[PDB]
């Protein structure tokens, strides 16, 4: 702890989602039915502590590694060393997109070709918390997989894609839920377009490049909330006031943030109390 | 602002030429006298060079519209790519000496498609905004490099990831060992495919996003670094980082160092500062 809190001086649309390796394309708020979120990737406190399956690098985000025997995939850590089931949900980096089927692109060290692995996260065979998931036709061998595209969940039949959810890792001690804190504030999300047969937008709490910055800096959290300005890098104009909270999330008061340009920069202004009332965006 | 590097262990970081974890530190074979990678290029005062993006979400990716014969490239956010003096759109893969296999997906459509890329033919002209479709049907796609294989031409050549592709039919500059027994240092990643492929880059991607944000003034000819064990704080080896954005060491070598250490800035020094062999 040698330096006060800062955020990267980088425009948002140049940064990445922290739940999949996708560029950020917009700022968003959640639909009315979403009362909290509990993402397991993209979780980092303002003083740089990773939570959940969150890796510090995008090269580990929304990836799996393991050995298929034709019936199950026995998971490992992404570097191939053993995954030991524990109180938590899954190996570091494991995808955390609930409310959809996954289509994971599987490749191999020492073999040609790629294979699409179709993952329904709802059946009893999907237990990454215990180190295994159904092979669903993936032949025997060792693979690394990265999430490629998504589709509506296979069960319940006819349900819609809902990326505000996390999967059923168990048959679990999770990174904690994030709640709107009051004072008219709503949670702010960094959105990315996800391929697949709809207009899918994947929300996350922090760009991945913020996470690697915070994890390296480990700046002291010296107030209840960090007042930020979302700034136009050309003019320096303040486009909107936001608060970042220690657990690692941002809020604003909508007038909204979805209408803001995506090429701005979040800039730390001051530590403030949780009672600090924001000007509507 | 003082110069710093991230306080993060190397094996937790990513290659800057493909979205792959770093698995070792390496040096080049004797026949490699320089490198000219176009991704993973960032000066010590935080200026990106070449096709290098600041985020791994843009690394080794393509975007464009196939008409069944050619893919007309765009920037990765879909806005127009304008041919210019430089090599290709930001993020475009820079792995020479191999065929690429790119996983193509689409916004608003199901499925993925493997796109097989020989970078040697007359049709591979990303510098002019187009590459051969090689059977990819009409549509708009985003592609990410997935695996590689031996280059289709020259016939029988083997994979050589020290090379860059033939973008044309003005590049980030070449990087040279500076003298004094020093050799270039590379961050290596295992790349999927049928061979035992190791992809070198000059800088971890997370160093690039750090430098681009910090933009610490380059106040000397070289930055003396220590590669430090985070448990003991012991110096495992002396390295120098040079302003163009690369590291060197004097091998005794770096390939035997553990990969879970941290590079730490020690002092600005002259280019002539003599390193202790690793």
């Amino acid at each position: 702890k040698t330096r006060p809190f800062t955020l990267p001086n980088l425009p948002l649309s140049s940064l990445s989602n922290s739940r999949a390796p996708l560029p950020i394309s917009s700022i968003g708020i959640s639909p009315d039915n979403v009362q909290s979120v509990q993402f397991q990737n993209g979780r980092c406190t303002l003083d740089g502590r990773l939570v959940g399956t969150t890796p510090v690098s995008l090269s580990h985000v929304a990836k799996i590694r393991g050995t298929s025997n034709g019936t199950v995939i026995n998971l490992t850590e992404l570097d191939g060393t053993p995954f030991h089931p524990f109180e938590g949900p899954a190996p570091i980096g494991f995808p955390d997109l609930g409310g959809c089927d996954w289509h994971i692109n599987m490749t191999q060290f020492g073999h040609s070709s790629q294979t699409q692995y179709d993952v329904d996260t709802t059946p009893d065979t999907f237990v990454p918390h215990l180190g295994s998931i159904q092979a669903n036709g993936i032949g025997s061998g060792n693979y690394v997989g990265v999430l490629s595209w998504i589709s509506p969940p296979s069960h319940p039949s006819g349900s819609q894609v809902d990326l505000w959810k996390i999967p059923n890792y168990g048959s679990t001690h999770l990174a904690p839920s994030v709640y709107p804190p009051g004072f008219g504030e709503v949670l702010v999300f960094f959105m990315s377009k996800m391929p697949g047969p709809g207009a899918y937008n994947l929300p996350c709490l922090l760009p991945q490049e913020y996470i690697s910055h915070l994890a390296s800096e480990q700046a002291p959290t010296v107030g209840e909330a960090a007042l930020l300005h979302y700034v136009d890098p050309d003019t320096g104009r303040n486009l909107g006031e936001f608060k970042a909270y220690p657990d690692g999330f941002l809020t604003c008061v909508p007038n909204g943030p979805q209408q803001l340009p995506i090429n701005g920069v979040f800039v730390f202004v001051s530590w403030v109390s949780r009672f600090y009332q924001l000007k509507p965006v | 602002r003082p110069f710093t590097l991230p306080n993060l262990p190397l094996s937790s970081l990513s290659n800057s030429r493909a979205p792959l974890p770093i698995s070792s530190i390496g040096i080049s074979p004797d026949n490699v006298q320089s490198v000219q990678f176009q991704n993973g290029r960032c000066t010590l005062d935080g200026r990106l060079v070449g096709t290098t993006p600041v985020s791994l979400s843009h690394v080794a990716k393509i975007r464009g519209t196939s008409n069944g014969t050619v893919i007309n490239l765009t920037e990765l956010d879909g806005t127009p790519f304008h041919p210019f003096e430089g090599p290709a759109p930001i993020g475009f893969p820079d792995l020479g000496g191999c065929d690429w296999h790119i996983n193509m997906t689409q916004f608003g459509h199901s499925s993925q498609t493997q796109y097989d890329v020989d970078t040697t033919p007359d049709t591979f002209v990303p510098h002019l905004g187009s590459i051969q479709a090689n059977g990819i049907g009409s549509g708009n796609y985003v592609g990410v490099l997935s695996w590689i294989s031996p280059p289709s031409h020259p016939s029988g050549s083997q994979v050589d990831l020290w090379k860059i592709p033939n973008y044309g039919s003005h590049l980030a500059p070449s990087v040279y060992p500076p003298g004094f027994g020093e050799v270039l240092v590379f961050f290596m990643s295992k790349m999927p495919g049928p061979g035992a492929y190791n992809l070198p880059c000059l800088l971890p991607q997370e160093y690039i996003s750090h430098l681009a944000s910090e933009q610490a003034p380059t106040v000397g000819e070289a930055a003396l670094l220590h590669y430090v064990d985070p448990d003991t704080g012991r110096n495992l080896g002396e390295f120098k980082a040079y302003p163009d954005g690369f590291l060197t060491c004097v091998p005794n070598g770096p390939q035997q160092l553990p990969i879970n250490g941290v590079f730490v800035f020690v002092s600005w020094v002259s280019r002539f500062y003599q390193l202790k062999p690793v």
Partner: nanobody
Amino acid sequence: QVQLQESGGGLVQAGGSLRLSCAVSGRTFSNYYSGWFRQAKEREFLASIRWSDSTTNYADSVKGRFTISRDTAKNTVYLQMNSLKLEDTAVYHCAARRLATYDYWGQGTQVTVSS
């Protein structure tokens, strides 16, 4: 919250042995390094172990006498201290690092070596 709890310290005779344990709980991350430290002036690193593959790293001062190990079912890390010396008297702490920094610390346990 991540919690580390040491047990096993106390009085031990020179030339004898002591086994310390550190129970790790409340963890949401699947891999990390666990380390043992001691302090009598400045803190001294003794040993670390990587959770996934049990890779170890030892200080020269204790190599060959102390052994670090871990039980993945019990989520416990052990420091086996053999052929103890008077200079081994210190307060011993276990710690955990998710990346390069030990952010989580146990409460510490006194080890007193007598002759």
